[PDB]
Amino acid sequence: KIPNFVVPGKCASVDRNKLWAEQTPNRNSYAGVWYQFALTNNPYQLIEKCVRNEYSFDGKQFVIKSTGIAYDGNLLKRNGKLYPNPFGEPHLSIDYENSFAAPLVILETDYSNYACLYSCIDYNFGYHSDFSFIFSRSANLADQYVKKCEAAFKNINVDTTRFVKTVQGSSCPYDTQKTL
Amino acid sequence: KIPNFVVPGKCASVDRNKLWAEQTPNRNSYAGVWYQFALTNNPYQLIEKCVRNEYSFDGKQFVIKSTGIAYDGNLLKRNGKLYPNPFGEPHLSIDYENSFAAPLVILETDYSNYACLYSCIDYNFGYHSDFSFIFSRSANLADQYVKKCEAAFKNINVDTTRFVKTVQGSSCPYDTQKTL
Structure with missing residues (x-):
């Protein structure tokens, strides 16, 4: 029971059908560059800082x-x-x-x-x-949008105190990253 | 203090290239029914007994x-x-x-x-x-075949004392299972 990402109970119901209905026609608008602003403890993510997807x-x-x-x-x-x-x-x-x-x-x-x-x-x-x-x-994210995600996660009973901010910004060699 | 399936170090090399080439021409012979004789500790497998694939x-x-x-x-x-x-x-x-x-x-x-x-x-x-x-x-597997798997697992540095036998045999409702 020990790691903070091993949690009691069945995976939550998250109303996948409504979400699929909203998102499927807009796949094109989801393309482009996304920076990882924050994440909960993840043993599978090999990129620690400056995460650019x-x-x-x-x-x-x-x-x-x-x-x-x-x-x-x-x-x-x-x-x-x-x-x-x-x-x-x-x-x-x-x-x-x-x-x-x-x-x-x-x-x-x-x-x-x-x-x-x-x-x-x-x-x-x-x-x-x-x-x-x-x-x-x-690289940054306005508080209003951070708060929207906090609410969406709370709605499915994910403990939002589990989020940790990822290093982004001036210390990141993004221009080199794009050459890879 | 951690699970016995979380092991220090990296995944070993298991020579997939060789195996893949041996197996691509024989896909049809791999079909049909297979019974799980034993497995190492697996927190994902939902079927405990009489496992028939x-x-x-x-x-x-x-x-x-x-x-x-x-x-x-x-x-x-x-x-x-x-x-x-x-x-x-x-x-x-x-x-x-x-x-x-x-x-x-x-x-x-x-x-x-x-x-x-x-x-x-x-x-x-x-x-x-x-x-x-x-x-x-x-439902059963002779020691001669078990030993072959034991050798193959030992060859990739897996501790075979981790294997646990699965319930199989005359107590399993295989004929009902096959109709699900």
């Missing part, structure tokens, strides 16, 4: 080039994909090279400033693990 | 119906798929409805008696988790 939409999936500073302080690029769940469930699968693929729900987004992202996995002992993220179109 | 191959992937008795004592059927890793990596993704997808390597198999299966993931904090399975074409 560049999305390209092809009609059937998104291809993702994720860059930033790894936990050893070196530059890192990771290749990802975001595509409809293969069983026809109303959510996307986020899939990264040399890693696994997980469900990814967009709880809320305005496309132009912020996105609130959520993934959850159930265990056979009656607990779950979830992984949440706040994305911004910029 | 029925595979059909359609030319590009396997469709799986997995059945047995869940941890609550009820019969359970899970829908799965096994398909090539989307990035072109030389391994398969095992994917289940209402769950996630993971890399799956067939470490060794003779197609008609046994298969030794392996999944491994590297975390960002200097550990990995792996999940190993011994599959049989029948």
Whole structure:
């Protein structure tokens, strides 16, 4: 029961069908660059700082080039994909090279400033693990949008005190990151 | 102080290139019914007893119906798929409805008696988790085939004392399971 991302109970119901209905026609507007503003404790994210996720939409999936500073302080690029769940469930699968693929729900987004992202996995002992993220179109994110994500996560009973801010801004070599 | 499936170090090299080439021409022979003989501690597997995995191959992937008795004592059927890793990596993704997808390597198999299966993931904090399975074409598996899997797992530095036998045999309602 020990890690803060292993939580009692079944994964939450998050009203995936409404969200899919809103988002499917707007995939094109979700493309472009998203910076990771904050996330809950994630053992699978290899990029610690300056996390910059560049999305390209092809009609059937998104291809993702994720860059930033790894936990050893070196530059890192990771290749990802975001595509409809293969069983026809109303959510996307986020899939990264040399890693696994997980469900990814967009709880809320305005496309132009912020996105609130959520993934959850159930265990056979009656607990779950979830992984949440706040994305911004910029290095910083206005408080009003941070608060929108806090509310969306609270609505599905995710403890929002679990969020930790990611290093972004002037200390980041974004211009080099884009060459990778 | 941590689970026995969270292991220091990185995922070992298991020579996927060799295995992938041996297995692509034999997909049809891998189809049919496989029973889980034993597995290492797995917090994801929802079927506790009488685990029976029925595979059909359609030319590009396997469709799986997995059945047995869940941890609550009820019969359970899970829908799965096994398909090539989307990035072109030389391994398969095992994917289940209402769950996630993971890399799956067939470490060794003779197609008609046994298969030794392996999944491994590297975390960002200097550990990995792996999940190993011994599959049989029948409810039982002779020591001669078990020993082959034992050797293959030892060859990749997996502690085989981690294996636990799965309930199978005349007490399992296989004929009911196959109709779910």
